[PDB]
């Protein structure tokens, strides 16, 4: 009953983020999952990294998976290091406080781009859903957002305060302006979608799907459709995938490069005036040996650009930014698929590459996999033997956290752990089996052919004299450890394909895992068939057996851990947990709490006499695929997909009242500005606008016709009748106002209408009674202006009943064939007359 | 030119675009079955007569030479095939298959079936050879032996048509019944299934896209669907009897379909310029959406109703009415620009316009905006032409009586506002 | 005469007279039209 935490991270140089350089080659920052490294490309180690508060692990963090870094931009003036991470969250921090100091979450999605200016304290940011969202640093609020787009953000261009040009996958430019802060223009860019979008001032360059950049022009023009945006060029022929990224760089001719989806990244340059007047007096040369002219015209695209050259990587790549000096050499840095950083350097003379091929150096690969790990030992609490799919076994330590050694054997599929001398024997995909060493040379045997296909599984004795491995040609081999050589005592045939082995712990059981999903179980001196474990519904993958030998944890394809016991053959329990598959099980080696690993990237940690979670572990986020625990003191080792290795160790006012509210404000308002204004005439002070009023935009007739729309129309009636006679009369003031203003007048003409008339339906006899003047002039223009608009909407209303009335003859006259026969044109109307159905009872 | 071997003892050339007719004799009989090479100048006639004859093309001087003659056996040459050419054009052999159970491989004769045979491909790479019967069956031999190499079995009632899907390399086949059948050379066994289909299937090829198979169909139609899932993409239907003939074009793709009776069509491809003309509409409508939007936001009342009425958007529409009203609050009932644009309407825009405006004129808050539309559309458009215009009596029909609902609910608002003139003669007259 | 429900697909139109069009709507206000017809469809 311990706390479990993490304590580790290894394997993972570069993940799926972008890579920020810094000068002084300089150094790189790049990201690890849910972490982000910077090191220099000298020698390549972890100057620093940045965590966070509480680890992963503990009772507090949540149950998820924290978010990748996908995201990440400094300022190296300002000396900040924005953020995003793929829940779509910004942190910011220092280089060298290297600390977090604010934090912001408008989005909710994955954070794509991050264009911030440290100069005017502005962060830019662009997501997965589809709107961008301009934040301030120091007013540390979301200052606002565009959001015009369909599906996401993936190129992105900003200027001053001014302009903002975005390119989405639903496949269009829009051209933002920020004053306004609407989008002024829109262009479909290409047919699918598009992702890159590269900005000098003068032309813009715009990827597609299909190996076609767009050559664009930009300007500030007054048109409304063109102007500000034109179409000029069309270029073909990158590469068949799709181009990622456009970045670019200058000195004076000036570079760019397009970051495509396979291992190419191709390096374009423009050229500068003279060369322009060269290429168009040849074309013009082409032309005297219109519509050539035009011809020309089209070629525009091929005359301005100029494909320097291209870089073949290795395997694939993720991204790449530009190190350029003295005009004659230029470098990349470029981190690929698989954890690998590459320095590419190219020297040129302005005109040609001066080489056949640019020359790769400055590369960091060490301190990762390369690959995904497939299996894990660990080695008396002293070293790790990690090995994955490119031949790469690889000698770890706890302490300093580095390599030791690396040899190359192919696919490999299972690395076990022989304690004398520290050897490691590991068995492959091709079906064969090696062994090396870790103090003397590499290699020691490769016994080739062991099996005729892929071996799946390996363990051996307590003693270290026997090896038992297990090879999907229904084979199960023992072997003996002759003095360094190996043999095989025995060789047993099966009938379906073994996929696991396990030896008990003390010498006594041999447990096997056949794909008919069943588990035989051997005495080890007799090979005898002491017991067979049934009813697993799909294939078990991984077998464990109790320091005792007495209990078998069990594992299958179908997300349920089974439990029986050795003394009969009996399941215990049943347990159902890891919604994908498990894919391993380890005890504890002093008692009955184990841990299993499973395809959807959680780590569980049981109590076995409870049958009971103790512990839910959240590390990383792609497919666990391997779990060792310590022989004797208990730290957890578990390596997954996204070569990942994580160690673990233990620890109301009602209707009427807000109309009476409002009209006291309103006409308090309008009084103390028509006061102002008789003293205005008697000059020939401005009193300041009530808050309500300054904070809404309204003039403060609109905010009383605003609350008398907000009443609702079962309850008006009872609002005028509980308002009382001062407040009849600030109403009668109000409309006086709207008289004034025609429009608000005629654009609710009823309300207005139904309300002043049932005032003063209930009032008559009291402002009857009242004798004023002001009253009588108040009341007389009302009434003029009512009749006004009501006799106004009436002629319109019978001029278009009489025009309507004469169209509908006029045609009736035109196509309607009269019978002269009376009864015979009464059965045509009754026959042609329109009808309608009704439900009647009798 | 396309050639037609047709119920007549006379081979037809036709060109293709459809009047003129070239009519050859080679025989008696009538033809039976044709083949040409890939390349034109080589053609292959299997007719009724015993004789079987190639004739040389020349598209200089027009010439159809008949020079290759073969007598063969003594019943029925009922298929023919040559695959390929050397460079020299003596394209290398000649095999066809007959009406009793033999067929024969003549230099420019083993059992075949147990009933008569129904037609021959060849394959791309020239080496083996395909051939099934009305027996249930196929089967497949070499060019350089008769030795057979395989032999797929059976089936319900028939087969009609074999071809080979030439990229993918399979082996198609019309069945005798509704279906057809798709195998590959690896195993020989059921790769694919192609069922829906009517009556009989009588002719099956690949498409030049080489991911779709088009079968025709004996009750007058033709189906063309994607091999990968076995699913219609599209379904023709220009015939009326029968199907019989089916041949294409490769480089631009088009398909001939010809039946038992004289209709005679020619299908063409021309999904790039729907799909361009369809992107073109797109880029035309974000562009003017785009300009509706910032007119709509900066003013420009008129050009914002043009582009409403253009594209249809009727929200919009009567936002800008309405802002054209509240403007025009301060004989004109607008703007004057938009009274001249309404006078410049046409005909489907007038009727789409009146027929907003009646649903406007339902409710009783949007009435006086559908009343001054409707007063603008008849104080600048002709009365005759409005009457003549089709439903526009249907509609006027419609709009009447909430007028006059409308009219009487405001005559008794004046009606009512006479209470204000009473409470001044009652005012007035105490003071 | 009635308002009833719209001739194209491309349409709403409401028992009002507020007819819109789906090419000028907003995500959010799509998302509440479509939660209102879910339950009148669900209920009547």
Known sequence: ?842 | ?431 | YNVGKAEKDGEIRLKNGVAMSKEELTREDKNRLRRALKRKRSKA
Not at chain 1, 28 to 36: F, G, Q, R, W, Y
Not at chain 1, 98 to 121: P, R, S, W, Y
Not at chain 1, 398 to 423: D, M, N, Q, S, V
Not at chain 2, 164 to 179: E, P, V
């Open chain 2, 1 to 431: 030119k396309l050639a037609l071997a047709t119920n007549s003892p006379s081979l037809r050339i036709i060109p293709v675009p459809p009047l003129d007719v070239e009519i050859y004799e080679g025989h008696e009989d009538l033809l039976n079955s044709l083949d040409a090479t890939e390349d034109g100048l080589w053609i292959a006639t299997a007719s009724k007569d015993n004789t079987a004859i190639v004739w040389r093309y020349n598209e200089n001087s027009c010439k159809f030479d008949i020079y290759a003659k073969y007598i063969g056996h003594s019943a029925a040459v009922t298929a023919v095939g040559l695959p390929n050419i050397v460079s020299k054009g003596y394209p290398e052999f000649l095999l066809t298959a007959s009406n009793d159970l033999t067929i024969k491989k003549w230099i420019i004769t083993r059992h075949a079936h147990e009933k008569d045979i129904n037609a021959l491909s060849v394959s791309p790479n020239d080496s083996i050879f395909a051939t099934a019967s009305y027996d249930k069956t196929c089967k497949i031999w070499n060019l350089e032996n008769g030795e057979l190499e395989a032999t797929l079995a059976n089936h319900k009632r028939g087969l009609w048509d074999v071809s080979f899907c030439q990229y993918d390399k399979l082996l198609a086949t019309s069945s005798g019944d509704k279906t057809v059948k798709i195998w590959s050379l690896d195993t020989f066994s059921v790769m694919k299934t192609l069922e829906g289909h009517t009556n009989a299937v009588q002719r099956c090829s690949f498409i030049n896209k080489q991911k779709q198979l088009i079968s025709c169909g004996a009750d007058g139609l033709i189906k063309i669907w994607d091999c990968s899932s076995g699913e219609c993409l599209k379904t023709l239907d220009g015939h009326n009897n029968r199907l019989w003939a089916l041949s294409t074009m490769n480089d631009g793709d088009m398909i001939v379909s010809a039946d038992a009776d004289g209709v005679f069509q020619f299908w063409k491809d021309c999904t790039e310029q729907e799909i361009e003309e369809e992107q073109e509409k797109a880029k035309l409508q974000v562009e003017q959406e785009q300009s509706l939007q910032n007119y709509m936001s900066k003013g420009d009342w008129t050009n914002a109703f043009l582009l409403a009425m253009t594209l249809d958007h009727p929200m919009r529409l009567f936002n800008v009415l309405k802002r054209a009203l509240g403007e025009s609050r301060s004989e004109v009932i607008f703007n004057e620009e938009l009274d001249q644009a309404i006078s410049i309407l046409n005909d489907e825009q007038l009727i789409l316009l009146m027929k907003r405006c009646r649903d406007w004129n339902t409710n009783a808050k949007t009435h006086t905006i559908a009343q001054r539309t409707i007063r603008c559309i008849l104080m600048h458009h002709n009365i005759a032409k409005l009457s003549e215009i089709p439903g526009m009596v249907k509609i006027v029909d419609a709009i009447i009586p909430y007028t006059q609902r409308h009219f009487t609910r405001v005559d008794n608002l004046v009606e009512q506002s006479y209470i204000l003139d009473y409470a001044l003669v009652e005012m007035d007259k105490l003071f």
């Open chain 1, 1 to 842: 009953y311990q706390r479990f935490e993490q304590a580790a991270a290894f394997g993972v140089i570069a993940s799926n983020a972008n890579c920020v350089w810094i000068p002084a080659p300089g150094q790189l920052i790049t990201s690890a999952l849910e972490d982000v490294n910077i090191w220099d490309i000298k020698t390549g180690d972890l100057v620093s990294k940045l965590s966070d508060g509480l680890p992963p692990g503990a009772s507090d963090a949540r149950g998820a998976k924290p978010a990748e870094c996908t995201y990440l931009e400094a300022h190296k003036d300002t000396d900040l290091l924005a953020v995003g991470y793929a829940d779509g969250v910004i942190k910011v921090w220092d280089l060298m406080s290297k600390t977090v100091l604010l934090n912001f979450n408008g989005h909710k999605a994955a954070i794509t781009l991050l264009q911030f200016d440290g100069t005017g304290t502005r962060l830019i940011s662009g997501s997965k859903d589809s709107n961008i969202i301009v934040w301030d640093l120091v007013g540390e609020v979301g200052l606002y957002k565009l959001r015009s787009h369909k599906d996401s953000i993936t190129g992105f261009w900003c200027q001053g305060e001014d302009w903002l040009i975005s390119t989405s996958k639903d496949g269009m430019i829009k051209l933002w302006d920020l004053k306004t802060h609407q989008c002024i223009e829109t262009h479909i860019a290409h047919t699918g979608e598009c992702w890159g979008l590269a900005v000098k001032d003068d032309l813009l360059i715009t990827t597609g799907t299909d190996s076609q950049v767009k050559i664009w022009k930009l300007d500030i023009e007054n048109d409304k459709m063109g102007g500000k945006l034109t179409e000029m060029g069309i270029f073909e022929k990158q590469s068949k995938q799709r181009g990622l990224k456009i970045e670019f760089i200058t000195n004076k001719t000036s570079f760019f490069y397009i970051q495509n989806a396979d291992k190419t990244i191709e390096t374009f340059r423009i050229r500068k005036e003279e060369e322009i007047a060269r290429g168009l007096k040849k074309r013009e040369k082409r032309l005297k040996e219109e519509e050539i002219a035009k011809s020309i015209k089209e070629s525009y695209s091929s005359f301005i650009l100029h494909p320097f050259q291209t870089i073949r990587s290795l395997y694939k790549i993720k991204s790449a930014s530009w190190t350029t000096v003295s005009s004659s050499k230029l470098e990349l840095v470029l981190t690929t698929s698989s954890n690998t950083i590459e320095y590419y350097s190219i020297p040129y003379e302005k005109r040609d590459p001066t080489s056949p091929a640019p020359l790769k150096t400055h590369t960091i690969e060490l301190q990762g996999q390369r690959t995904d790990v497939r299996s894990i030992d660990i080695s008396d609490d002293n070293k790790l033997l990690a090995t994955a799919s490119n031949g790469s076994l690889k000698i770890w330590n706890i302490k300093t956290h580095k390599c030791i050694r690396t040899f190359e054997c192919g696919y490999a599929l299972t690395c076990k752990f022989l304690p004398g001398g520290l050897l490691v024997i590991l068995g492959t995909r091709n079906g064969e089996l090696q062994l090396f060493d870790l103090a003397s040379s590499s290699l020691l045997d490769t016994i080739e052919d062991a099996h005729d296909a892929a071996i799946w599984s390996l363990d051996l004795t307590s003693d270290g004299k026997r090896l038992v491995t297990g090879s999907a040609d229904k084979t199960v081999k023992f072997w003996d450890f002759k003095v360094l050589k190996l043999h095989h005592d025995t060789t047993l045939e099966l009938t379906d394909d073994i996929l696991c082995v396990r030896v008990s712990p003390d010498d006594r059981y041999l447990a096997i895992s056949l794909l008919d999903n069943t588990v035989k179980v051997f005495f080890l001196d007799s090979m005898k068939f002491y017991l067979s474990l049934y009813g697993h519904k799909l294939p078990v993958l991984s077998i464990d057996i109790s320091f005792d030998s007495k209990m078998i944890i069990t594992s299958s394809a179908d997300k349920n851990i089974k439990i029986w016991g050795l003394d009969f053959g009996d399941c215990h329990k049943s347990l159902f947990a890891h919604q994908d598959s498990i894919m391993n099980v380890k005890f504890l080696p002093q008692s009955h709490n184990f841990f299993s690993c499973s395809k959807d990237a959680v780590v569980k940690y049981w109590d076995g006499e409870k049958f009971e979670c103790i512990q839910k572990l959240y590390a990383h986020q792609s497919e666990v695929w391997a779990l060792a625990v310590a022989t004797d003191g208990g730290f957890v080792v578990s390596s997954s997909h996204d070569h990942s290795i994580r160690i673990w160790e233990e620890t109301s006012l009602k209707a009427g009242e807000r109309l009476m509210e409002a009209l006291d404000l309103g006409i308090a308002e309008i009084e103390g500005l028509e006061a102002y204004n008789r003293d205005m005439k008697l000059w020939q002070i401005k009193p300041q606008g009530n808050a309500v009023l300054i904070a809404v935009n309204k003039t403060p007739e609109q905010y009383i016709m605003d609350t008398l729309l907000r009443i609702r129309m079962s309850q008006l009636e009872d609002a005028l009748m509980v308002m009382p006679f001062s407040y009849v009369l600030k109403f009668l003031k109000f409309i006086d106002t709207v008289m004034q203003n025609k429009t608000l007048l005629h654009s609710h003409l009823p309300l207005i209408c139904k309300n002043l008339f049932f005032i003063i339906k209930f009032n008559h006899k009291e402002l009857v009674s009242q004798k004023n003047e002001e009253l009588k002039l108040q009341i007389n223009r009302v009434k003029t202006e009512l009749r006004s608009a009501l006799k106004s909407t009436e002629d319109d209303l019978g001029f278009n009943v009489q025009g309507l009335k004469f169209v509908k003859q006029q045609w009736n006259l035109r196509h309607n064939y009269e019978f002269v026969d009376e009864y015979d044109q009464q059965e045509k109307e009754s026959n042609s007359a329109r009808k309608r159905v009704f439900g009647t009872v009798i």
